[PDB]
């Protein structure tokens with residue numbers, strides 16, 4: 001039960017080349033066969049590569065799979081980008097028994113200029129505390145492409161439980177907005193020195209921190 | 216070069232049994248293993264059946280796979296149907312020359328109960344005021360069905376500029392979440408006694424109010 005690690009997102013303009021990596025965690029990449037699946041928004045998945053570099057019939061020559069043994073990774077390289085190439089791409093391999101999927105990479109064929117997110121982190125409101133709630137909100141607006149990943153820290157430990165993040169939506173300025181909220185009890189919020197929201201967009205990561213003591 | 220044919224959609228009410236078929240166009244259904252995947256929109260898919268009828272751990276035993284050699288099909292049967300089973304389901308098999316997916320079945324669970332939204336209004340953070348911004352966020356969560364309308368007030372008067380509301384998205388609890396944010400200047404925020412966010416859902420309105428606080 002090993003892991004395959006893919007970038008969360010990639011972008012390029014029409015006619016360019018883009019590459020999506022898939023790094024094996026503990027194992028030997030050439031030990032087992034890697035597949036690549038395309039999923040366009042609102043569509044069924046489609047095999048574009050099997051057995052590391054084989055193209056199914058009807059998949060164009062612009063899709064190419066490869067293996068790097070020294071880096072222990074698989075790559076999908078797409079040349080001559082077209083707007084229809086915009087989709088989620090997932091790598092997949094095998095152990096002695098086990099099937100392992102990568103977490104997926106969103107490929108945007110740029111339809112507008114790139115824009116980095118505005119990120120604002122809010123501490124609990126006085127009113128929700130009296131309701132025994134210490135929900136923190138991380139507002140993420142004015143970004144393009146519409147792909148972000150959010151990670152929360154309690155002090156400096158990753159927080160797993162309590163996190164929700166909305167699907168990015170296009171706003172009146174034609175850029176995306178989303179919010180992530182962490183549903184703390186007041187006891188959990190007071191019991192730490194600070195909490196942090198990390199937002200990754202186009203592989204650039206920003207971090208904001210709030211604390212019970214900040215006046 | 217065979218195809219797998221599943222219904223586009225199916226609907227059923229809670230506690231009932233639903234069946235999703237997957238018909239192989241050419242060759243025998245039993246010549247290659249069939250997998251079933253569940254996918255909630257915004258999320259990556261999960262494996263619910265492999266090798267025709269094997270369940271990974273963490274998959275409820277309410278999920279069962281089978282083969283019918285005579286109708287040349289595979290079936291996913293979900294018994295004791297629950298709201299969280301609402302999702303897209305894909306079958307998948309092998310061509311030796313390809314990995315083949317069905318077209319996907321969107322399963323609708325009927326008769327989900329109305330749920331009123333939780334509404335939390337956050338005043339500007341100290342850090343954004345120091346960067347000359349006074350954005351308010353109104354976090355709206357746990358509502359069903361997935362539509363609200365938001366109106367903002369400055370003192371008692373309607374706000375007509377600077378409001379954005381995200382498109383509601385279904386969260387892990389199968390209820391919807393959205394944020395409305397009002398992009399104020401520090402001057403606008405301090406020149407009023409309060410701002411209010413008013414959320415309407417299925418005829419009921421909830422109103423929350425925040426005021427500049429003297430730190």
Ligand SMILES: CCN(CC)c1ccc2c(C)c(CCOC(=O)NCc3cccc(-c4cnc[nH]4)c3)c(=O)oc2c1
Nearest residue numbers: 037045090099100101102103252259260261262265271
């Ligand atoms: C769109 C492409 N696609 C096909 C529907 C994906 C795309 C991504 C995924 C991911 C990330 C997971 C979660 C991680 O799953 C795994 O690593 N393995 C799944 C699994 C678990 C147990 C048994 C099997 C299995 C399948 N055949 C034999 N054994 C597979 C997953 O389970 O399924 C995925 C399917």
